[PDB]
Ligand SMILES: CCCCCCCCCCCCCCCC(=O)OC[C@H](COP(=O)(O)OCCN)OC(=O)CCCCCCCCCCCCCCC
């Protein structure tokens with residue numbers, strides 16, 4: 001099943017992936033949501049094992065971690081204006097988040113390429129490309145019945161920015 005997949009993930013990872021999956025299921029579709037959750041789960045498990053086997057150091061994720069935190073912060077600044085403006089009016093903050101997430105993608109690919117086979121690399125590009133697209137943020141912020149689900153996601157991203165990775 002899938003219960004053994006999520007157990008090797010910290011609780012903050014389960015919360016974040018759960019809220020993300022809810023969001024994808026709202027704006028996109030169910031198969032896209034389960035696909036993205038399988039992707040993030042596989043990536044995170046393989047990374048955690050690559051660090052536990054000392055194949056890579058914890059500092060090797062410094063740039064990925066920084067870019068992820070910056071994208072999450074930009075998504076918080078944009079979440080401040082949810083329900084008061086449209087996604088086209090908030091294009092600045094959201095494209096800042098998208099650029100940060102693209103940096104996170106490129107550094108993740110840079111780090112994991114000597115280990116993954118090319119299919120898992122393309123899986124990285126697909127996951128980051130979908131979850132970090134400005135069209136994705138545009139669809140989320142324009143949707144009306146998400147404030148409840150988006151609040152859980154932003155709250156999950158906030159407490160990741162509190163766990164300093166060092
Ligand atoms: C768009 C983004 C897609 C990303 C998909 C690929 C997965 C990321 C791969 C790189 C790993 C990151 C660094 C790992 C360090 C680490 O994991 O440490 C941090 C904690 C601690 O864990 P610990 O104390 O047990 O171990 C520590 C021993 N070293 O773990 C986690 O909370 C993992 C959380 C993963 C982040 C979620 C990724 C998905 C984000 C989706 C939301 C963004 C879009 C929002 C749309 C509106």
Ligand code: NA
Pocket residue numbers: 145146147148149150
């Ligand atoms: Na909602």
